[PDB]
């Protein structure tokens, strides 16, 4: 595992079902390593353009899930980060790109990925009231 290896595959990352389950199979492989790779990824994540973002929450959706039957380092290691993780992603993109957001966090929701207190500050992140404070 290496941090610049990681960095470049972010970089080149992209929506296709190739990209994101091959970053996927690798990062599960390497989740000894799973807290440097959060901290990489959610750095990468802010660097990404608006048009990008959502692929980053694709990726962790997809590491999340799976990584679940190899055991609990990256369900563990995502959930400090993942909150902030769907606020900034919703407050830089379209309105209308919540429906990519939400279908994320109602697969979730409906496959229980995260627990209960997680889960709701999830849905603030998402739809609360702090998106609507300024005039537009």
Known sequence: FSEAALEKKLSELSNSQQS???LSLWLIHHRKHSRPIVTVWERELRKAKPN???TFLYL???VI???KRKGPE???DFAPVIVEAFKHV???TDESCKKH???VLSIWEERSVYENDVLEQLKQALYGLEHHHHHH
């Open 52 to 54: 990008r973002k959502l």
């Open 74 to 76: 990256f369900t563990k």
């Open 60 to 62: 962790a959706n997809d």
């Open 65 to 67: 899930q799976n990584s």
């Open 101 to 103: 957001l939400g279908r």
């Open 20 to 22: 994101v389950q091959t």
């Open 90 to 92: 919703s407050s830089e």
